[PDB]
């Protein structure tokens, strides 16, 4: 199972750094993930780090984005977003590039299968990630079944492609599952609580997928506060 393959351990979390916090040594040879604990793009990299067993290797540097140290855009990462990864004398951004990079260049269990047909489907699903987010996050003011429905339907139908297991690529938990879960997690809570919309209604495979991803310790360790998420999304979109 995916849980058996998981190399994560329970982890103590340091408080996020505010505007006055000292800057961690830059390019001292220690690998660092600049992040924010509630950011779903960063959560992608967080889960990947955990699953591959890279927690000691990859130090977390969590920031309060609403009140972040100026040294971050000035001295670490000019695009001024999280996540970014400090490794091999550079700072690399883009959550999808980062989970791919952990998988191609770091130790730990595989998060991409070898099967060529699965590799191709993975690329299609990676490509669809911003269209998925684009569709649902712009649907809050309209008829949800018309506006957000087709995007969840796309995930439901994608899950019918490989019949050897409940994940997007079938049998094995992968980078694809990791790419989607932080957004499905938050969307599920927000839509149900605020709009009375159950994304799992009529989407059997999607429901199985959420349940199965949720058995994985690497993921559970990274989950955000439901109540805080709702207040945040009401303020952001309503």
Which positions lie near Ca ion, rule CB under 5 A?
A: 53, 56, 160, 163
- Of 53-61, 78-86, 155-163, 213-221, the window that binds ligand GSH (rule: CB under 6 A) is 78-86
Q: Compute the chain's Rg from CA coordinates.
A: 18
Residues 6+ apart with CB under 8 A from 181: 47, 210, 213, 219
Both tokens assigned to 131: 């269209």
Smallest distance from ligand GSH to CB 129, Å: 9
What is the spatial distance between Cα 1 and Cα 3, in angstroms, rounded to a whole number?
5
Q: In the bound complex, what is the minimum distance in angstroms from residue 111's beta carbon to ligand GSH?
A: 17
Report what 152 binds from ligand GSH, Ca ion, none; CB cut-off 5-8 Å by kind.
Answer: none
Q: Which does 122 bind (CB under 5 to 8 A by kind): ligand GSH, Ca ion, none?
A: none
The CA-CA-CA angle for residues 172, 6, 219, to 5°, reads 90
Q: Which tokens hold the place of 56?
A: 């000691």
How far is residue 199 from each of residues 27, 58, 186, 196, 223, measured CA to CA in Å? 44, 34, 11, 10, 19
- Tell me which of 65, 144, 207, 210 binds ligand GSH, using CB under 6 A: 65
Cβ at position 230, least distance to ligand GSH in Å = 16
User: Residue 181, interface with ligand GSH (CB under 6 A)?
Assistant: no
Please answer whether residues 110 and 123 qualify as being in contact, where contact means their C-beta atoms are separated by less than 8 angstroms: no
Q: Which stretch binds ligand GSH (CB under 6 A): 76-84, 137-145, 162-170, 222-230?
A: 76-84
Site residues (CB under 6 A) for ligand GSH? Answer: 39, 41, 65, 80-83, 93-95
């Amino acid at each position: 199972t995916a849980s058996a393959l998981d190399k994560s351990v329970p982890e103590k979390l340091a408080p996020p750094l505010d505007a006055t916090a000292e800057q961690p040594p830059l390019f001292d040879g220690t690998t660092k993930l600049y992040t924010c604990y509630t950011c779903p793009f960063a959560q992608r990299v967080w889960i990947t780090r955990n699953f591959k067993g890279l927690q000691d290797e990859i130090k977390l540097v969590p920031l309060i984005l609403q009140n972040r140290p100026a040294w971050y855009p000035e001295k670490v990462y000019p695009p001024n977003k999280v996540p970014s990864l400090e490794h091999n004398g550079k700072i690399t951004g883009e959550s999808l590039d980062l989970i791919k990079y952990l998988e191609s260049n770091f130790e730990g269990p595989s998060l991409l299968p070898k099967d060529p047909a699965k590799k191709e489907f993975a690329e299609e699903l990676f490509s669809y990630t911003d269209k998925f987010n684009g569709t649902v996050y712009t649907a809050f003011k309209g008829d949800l079944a018309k506006e957000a429905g087709p995007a969840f339907d796309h995930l439901e139908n994608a899950l019918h492609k490989f019949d050897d297991g409940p994940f997007f690529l079938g049998k094995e938990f992968s980078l694809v599952d990791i790419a989607y879960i932080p957004f499905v997690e938050r969307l599920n809570i927000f839509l149900l609580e605020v709009f009375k919309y159950d994304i799992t209604a009529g989407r059997q495979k999607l429901a199985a997928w959420i349940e199965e991803v949720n058995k994985i310790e690497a993921y559970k360790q990274t989950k955000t506060d439901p109540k805080e998420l709702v207040e945040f999304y009401k303020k952001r979109f309503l």
